[PDB]
Amino acid sequence: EEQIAEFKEAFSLFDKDGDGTITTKELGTVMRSLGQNPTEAELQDMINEVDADGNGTIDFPEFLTMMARKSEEEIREAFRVFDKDGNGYISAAELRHVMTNLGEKLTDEEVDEMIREADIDGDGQVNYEEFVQMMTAK
Amino acid sequence: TEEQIAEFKEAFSLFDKDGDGTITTKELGTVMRSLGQNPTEAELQDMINEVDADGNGTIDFPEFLTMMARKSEEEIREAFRVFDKDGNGYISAAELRHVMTNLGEKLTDEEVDEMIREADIDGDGQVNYEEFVQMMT
């Protein structure tokens, strides 16, 4: 309920026009302020994921339900732990060292496989964004 | 730090909308407006002048890096969470008194009320999360 007041302030960032719903281009303008430039197609499937009624827009109750899914920077902290040289990439060498510290008796193949599980761009290392993708994956 | 200048160029680009190299007073205004705040040209000017090392009116990348070096915003949310026991979003003089007593502070009722009315801006009698970072800065 105090939480609803905070979520109404949060919805207002997305709902520039204040009509009660978050359109696809409203998701686009906010994404663009964060430098991300997705296509109209990408914004549509992003909304469609959290569109219970399928009306194309996300209303305040739908938005509330999504926030209730579920601290969002805990991953930032974990990544900083794994990325030892602070270069922003988790090498398989760094992961191996971190697993050994936590007592994981993981072989060289298991470590390389973990790198390949989270390496989307295929650079051989897991950057922050790749780590956040793996941490926030249901 | 050498690979950190990367993450600050991504942060700087967000404000330098035109990419001329400097964040003008109106470019900060547009980023602030995207965050719901609609500050005045005067409020934006004193905000830049604070982190304007040369006083030319705009922040080039080197001044921006210098400003970012100074300091701890997400750890403040944790501290507020510690003071606010009942989770109501407001720190009562009672909540502050208990947290001070737990930490060994021999603070009298007046010292505690003075800390409350010190961070009390809207006169809510309580130290809101906002009101708390305003004094934490």
Partner: peptide, 23 residues
Amino acid sequence: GQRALQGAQAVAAAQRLVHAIAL
């Protein structure tokens, strides 16, 4: 120092949002 903080406030919220919408 009021408008100033209210900015850093809303951002904390925008990232909790683009997190859930985005994931």
